């Protein structure tokens, strides 16, 4: 279909300052990080749509290598030469994979909710089982029906009914086929265990955790990261406490 890059929204800041390149989570889009990112009016900001999502819905990938290649291509096309990657959940995993492969111009990586990888064949088989079942639902069921159950998952337990309904309605603005393909392609089941790579890193790496997010606080500690704990926040700290996340990002980026 032609020479492709990822769809993204660019905001230009001061010349000489780095770009902040933001990566959303599964089912989301490039609006995910804008409430937080637009606080950094002096930086340039790139809000990327991952394959299968937003304006990148028609861009398919077979795995992380394809995603990393597309991200690299996109950065080159925008002439982004110095940048931070900031990723939430799947976007955090994309950021870690790309940084570990190696990206020219990378200043550092900041992750919220990004799993560094499973550690044995057993955990992987089970995540593969779970992801395959979701994939088949996204591939065959009306999106609203799938998302209705999606938001009943334990990670969303802290939500109320109005919030769940809102999210179901919002995320039903996606395509099921492209979401399914991306879910499969970048499944945690096929991701390497990045602990060794992260330990041996030559780039800066920071972790943000909602106070209530015990799962990712534990994972951040496994990565020997001193997590920036965001008060009054759970599984999506940048959404639940945007001012707190802005403060933490300012502490990290500006010093």
Short mmCIF file of C-alpha atoms in Angstrom, two decimals:
data_model
loop_
_atom_site.label_atom_id
_atom_site.label_comp_id
_atom_site.label_asym_id
_atom_site.label_seq_id
_atom_site.Cartn_x
_atom_site.Cartn_y
_atom_site.Cartn_z
CA UNK A 1 0.00 0.00 0.00
CA UNK A 2 3.07 2.27 -0.03
CA UNK A 3 5.88 3.49 2.26
CA UNK A 4 4.43 3.31 5.78
CA UNK A 5 5.09 4.77 9.19
CA UNK A 6 2.91 4.63 12.29
CA UNK A 7 0.14 7.19 12.62
CA UNK A 8 0.99 9.73 15.32
CA UNK A 9 0.12 13.22 16.52
CA UNK A 10 3.14 15.54 16.79
CA UNK A 11 3.41 18.67 18.91
CA UNK A 12 6.51 20.79 18.36
CA UNK A 13 8.24 22.36 21.34
CA UNK A 14 11.54 24.19 21.76
CA UNK A 15 14.34 23.39 19.32
CA UNK A 16 17.12 21.58 21.18
CA UNK A 17 14.81 19.89 23.66
CA UNK A 18 14.17 16.16 23.29
CA UNK A 19 10.98 14.56 22.07
CA UNK A 20 8.72 12.72 24.47
CA UNK A 21 7.37 9.73 22.54
CA UNK A 22 4.27 8.29 24.22
CA UNK A 23 2.91 4.77 23.69
CA UNK A 24 -0.62 3.81 24.80
CA UNK A 25 -2.01 0.47 26.00
CA UNK A 26 -4.04 -2.25 24.33
CA UNK A 27 -7.41 -1.04 22.95
CA UNK A 28 -6.40 2.60 23.49
CA UNK A 29 -5.00 5.21 21.13
CA UNK A 30 -2.76 8.23 20.91
CA UNK A 31 -5.03 10.27 23.20
CA UNK A 32 -4.01 8.10 26.17
CA UNK A 33 -1.07 10.21 27.34
CA UNK A 34 -2.13 13.66 26.11
CA UNK A 35 -3.54 14.95 29.41
CA UNK A 36 -0.14 14.31 31.01
CA UNK A 37 2.11 14.98 28.02
CA UNK A 38 0.72 18.39 27.16
CA UNK A 39 2.01 19.66 30.49
CA UNK A 40 5.47 19.45 28.89
CA UNK A 41 4.81 22.35 26.57
CA UNK A 42 8.51 23.07 26.12
CA UNK A 43 9.34 19.53 24.91
CA UNK A 44 8.22 18.16 21.58
CA UNK A 45 5.63 15.38 21.96
CA UNK A 46 4.81 12.43 19.69
CA UNK A 47 1.64 10.52 20.54
CA UNK A 48 1.90 7.27 18.60
CA UNK A 49 -0.89 4.89 17.55
CA UNK A 50 0.36 1.31 17.86
CA UNK A 51 -0.37 -1.20 15.08
CA UNK A 52 -4.01 -2.27 15.16
CA UNK A 53 -5.00 0.91 17.01
CA UNK A 54 -6.23 4.40 16.18
CA UNK A 55 -4.92 5.66 12.85
CA UNK A 56 -2.57 2.68 12.67
CA UNK A 57 -5.45 0.17 12.59
CA UNK A 58 -4.60 -0.98 9.06
CA UNK A 59 -0.93 -1.52 9.90
CA UNK A 60 -0.31 -5.15 10.85
CA UNK A 61 2.71 -6.76 12.50
CA UNK A 62 3.79 -10.34 13.09
CA UNK A 63 5.64 -9.63 16.33
CA UNK A 64 7.71 -7.18 18.32
CA UNK A 65 10.51 -6.97 15.75
CA UNK A 66 8.00 -5.56 13.25
CA UNK A 67 6.72 -3.08 15.84
CA UNK A 68 10.24 -1.94 16.72
CA UNK A 69 11.04 -1.54 13.03
CA UNK A 70 7.93 0.57 12.48
CA UNK A 71 8.69 2.70 15.54
CA UNK A 72 12.26 3.26 14.31
CA UNK A 73 10.98 4.15 10.82
CA UNK A 74 8.49 6.60 12.34
CA UNK A 75 11.13 8.35 14.45
CA UNK A 76 13.43 8.69 11.44
CA UNK A 77 10.60 10.09 9.30
CA UNK A 78 9.80 12.75 11.91
CA UNK A 79 13.55 13.51 12.20
CA UNK A 80 13.47 12.73 15.91
CA UNK A 81 17.11 12.44 16.97
CA UNK A 82 16.89 12.66 20.76
CA UNK A 83 13.92 11.21 22.62
CA UNK A 84 12.42 9.51 25.64
CA UNK A 85 9.97 6.61 25.32
CA UNK A 86 7.07 6.70 27.76
CA UNK A 87 4.80 3.64 27.66
CA UNK A 88 1.69 2.33 29.41
CA UNK A 89 0.99 -1.42 29.67
CA UNK A 90 1.35 -2.88 26.15
CA UNK A 91 3.01 0.41 25.18
CA UNK A 92 5.45 -0.07 28.05
CA UNK A 93 6.28 -3.54 26.72
CA UNK A 94 6.75 -2.12 23.22
CA UNK A 95 9.06 0.54 24.68
CA UNK A 96 11.14 -1.98 26.62
CA UNK A 97 11.45 -4.33 23.64
CA UNK A 98 12.49 -1.51 21.30
CA UNK A 99 14.98 -0.04 23.77
CA UNK A 100 16.49 -3.46 24.45
CA UNK A 101 16.88 -4.14 20.72
CA UNK A 102 18.60 -0.76 20.43
CA UNK A 103 17.39 2.65 19.27
CA UNK A 104 19.57 5.51 18.03
CA UNK A 105 18.93 8.73 19.96
CA UNK A 106 17.21 7.17 22.99
CA UNK A 107 17.59 9.24 26.19
CA UNK A 108 15.62 6.92 28.40
CA UNK A 109 12.52 4.81 28.95
CA UNK A 110 9.72 5.39 31.45
CA UNK A 111 7.20 2.60 31.98
CA UNK A 112 3.87 2.26 33.77
CA UNK A 113 2.28 -1.22 33.92
CA UNK A 114 4.77 -2.84 31.55
CA UNK A 115 5.49 -6.48 32.27
CA UNK A 116 9.19 -7.33 31.72
CA UNK A 117 8.31 -10.90 30.75
CA UNK A 118 7.28 -14.31 32.02
CA UNK A 119 9.96 -16.66 33.35
CA UNK A 120 9.12 -20.23 32.35
CA UNK A 121 7.29 -22.37 29.79
CA UNK A 122 4.34 -22.84 32.17
CA UNK A 123 3.46 -19.18 32.70
CA UNK A 124 3.84 -18.61 28.97
CA UNK A 125 1.56 -21.50 28.04
CA UNK A 126 -1.11 -20.10 30.37
CA UNK A 127 -0.83 -16.53 29.09
CA UNK A 128 -0.94 -18.00 25.58
CA UNK A 129 -4.14 -19.85 26.48
CA UNK A 130 -5.77 -16.75 27.96
CA UNK A 131 -4.67 -14.45 25.13
CA UNK A 132 -5.77 -16.96 22.46
CA UNK A 133 -9.26 -17.04 23.95
CA UNK A 134 -9.48 -13.24 23.94
CA UNK A 135 -8.09 -13.19 20.39
CA UNK A 136 -10.80 -15.55 19.18
CA UNK A 137 -13.46 -13.39 20.87
CA UNK A 138 -12.18 -10.20 19.25
CA UNK A 139 -12.08 -12.11 15.93
CA UNK A 140 -15.62 -13.47 16.03
CA UNK A 141 -17.87 -11.63 18.50
CA UNK A 142 -19.40 -8.16 18.38
CA UNK A 143 -16.85 -5.81 19.95
CA UNK A 144 -19.31 -4.49 22.55
CA UNK A 145 -19.94 -8.01 23.83
CA UNK A 146 -16.22 -8.70 24.16
CA UNK A 147 -15.45 -5.40 25.91
CA UNK A 148 -18.36 -5.89 28.32
CA UNK A 149 -16.53 -8.94 29.69
CA UNK A 150 -13.09 -7.37 29.20
CA UNK A 151 -13.84 -4.66 31.74
CA UNK A 152 -15.05 -7.20 34.31
CA UNK A 153 -11.45 -8.44 34.65
CA UNK A 154 -9.81 -8.06 38.10
CA UNK A 155 -7.49 -5.24 36.93
CA UNK A 156 -10.62 -3.09 36.53
CA UNK A 157 -12.13 -4.08 39.89
CA UNK A 158 -11.70 -0.56 41.30
CA UNK A 159 -13.97 0.91 38.60
CA UNK A 160 -17.67 1.54 39.15
CA UNK A 161 -20.43 0.51 36.72
CA UNK A 162 -20.69 3.92 35.00
CA UNK A 163 -16.94 3.89 34.36
CA UNK A 164 -17.08 0.40 32.87
CA UNK A 165 -20.01 1.27 30.61
CA UNK A 166 -18.18 4.38 29.44
CA UNK A 167 -15.05 2.41 28.60
CA UNK A 168 -17.06 -0.31 26.83
CA UNK A 169 -18.71 2.35 24.67
CA UNK A 170 -15.43 4.16 24.04
CA UNK A 171 -13.31 1.12 23.17
CA UNK A 172 -16.00 -0.37 20.99
CA UNK A 173 -14.58 2.28 18.65
CA UNK A 174 -11.89 -0.03 17.38
CA UNK A 175 -11.82 -2.83 14.89
CA UNK A 176 -11.95 -6.37 16.30
CA UNK A 177 -9.79 -7.96 13.61
CA UNK A 178 -6.95 -5.52 13.88
CA UNK A 179 -7.08 -5.58 17.68
CA UNK A 180 -7.00 -9.39 17.68
CA UNK A 181 -4.01 -9.51 15.33
CA UNK A 182 -2.06 -7.07 17.50
CA UNK A 183 -3.03 -8.82 20.74
CA UNK A 184 -1.68 -12.06 19.29
CA UNK A 185 1.45 -10.51 17.74
CA UNK A 186 2.63 -8.82 20.92
CA UNK A 187 1.21 -11.25 23.48
CA UNK A 188 3.14 -11.46 26.74
CA UNK A 189 3.31 -15.20 25.99
CA UNK A 190 5.83 -14.59 23.17
CA UNK A 191 7.84 -11.83 24.82
CA UNK A 192 11.31 -12.72 26.05
CA UNK A 193 12.20 -12.27 29.69
CA UNK A 194 13.77 -8.82 29.57
CA UNK A 195 15.25 -8.88 33.08
CA UNK A 196 18.80 -9.64 31.91
CA UNK A 197 18.61 -7.05 29.14
CA UNK A 198 17.29 -4.42 31.52
CA UNK A 199 19.95 -5.23 34.12
CA UNK A 200 22.66 -4.76 31.48
CA UNK A 201 21.08 -1.62 30.01
CA UNK A 202 23.03 1.39 28.76
CA UNK A 203 19.93 3.61 28.74
CA UNK A 204 18.05 5.29 31.57
CA UNK A 205 15.02 3.37 32.86
CA UNK A 206 12.33 4.55 35.29
CA UNK A 207 9.15 2.95 36.56
CA UNK A 208 5.87 4.63 37.65
CA UNK A 209 3.42 2.72 39.88
CA UNK A 210 0.00 3.56 41.27
CA UNK A 211 0.10 3.17 45.06
CA UNK A 212 -2.63 0.49 44.86
CA UNK A 213 -1.01 -1.42 41.98
CA UNK A 214 0.58 -4.17 44.04
CA UNK A 215 1.27 -6.31 40.96
CA UNK A 216 3.44 -3.74 39.21
CA UNK A 217 5.02 -2.42 42.38
CA UNK A 218 6.25 -5.99 42.84
CA UNK A 219 7.46 -6.23 39.23
CA UNK A 220 9.24 -2.86 39.44
CA UNK A 221 11.10 -4.17 42.50
CA UNK A 222 12.05 -7.35 40.57
CA UNK A 223 13.68 -5.04 38.01
CA UNK A 224 15.65 -3.38 40.82
CA UNK A 225 13.85 -0.12 40.04
CA UNK A 226 12.91 2.27 42.81
CA UNK A 227 9.38 2.89 41.59
CA UNK A 228 7.90 6.37 41.54
CA UNK A 229 4.79 5.64 43.57
CA UNK A 230 1.82 7.74 42.55
CA UNK A 231 -0.61 8.46 45.42
CA UNK A 232 -4.37 7.91 45.10
CA UNK A 233 -3.93 5.71 42.06
CA UNK A 234 -4.22 2.13 40.92
CA UNK A 235 -3.63 0.33 37.61
CA UNK A 236 -3.73 3.50 35.49
CA UNK A 237 -1.95 6.10 37.55
CA UNK A 238 -1.53 8.62 34.79
CA UNK A 239 -5.30 8.64 34.23
CA UNK A 240 -6.33 8.54 37.88
CA UNK A 241 -3.74 11.03 39.16
CA UNK A 242 -2.47 13.02 36.17
CA UNK A 243 -0.99 15.84 38.28
CA UNK A 244 0.96 13.31 40.35
CA UNK A 245 2.33 11.61 37.24
CA UNK A 246 3.21 14.99 35.72
CA UNK A 247 5.22 15.84 38.86
CA UNK A 248 7.06 12.50 38.77
CA UNK A 249 7.83 12.88 35.07
CA UNK A 250 9.12 16.41 35.68
CA UNK A 251 11.45 15.11 38.42
CA UNK A 252 12.78 12.44 36.05
CA UNK A 253 12.99 14.38 32.79
CA UNK A 254 14.16 17.78 33.98
CA UNK A 255 17.06 16.69 36.19
#
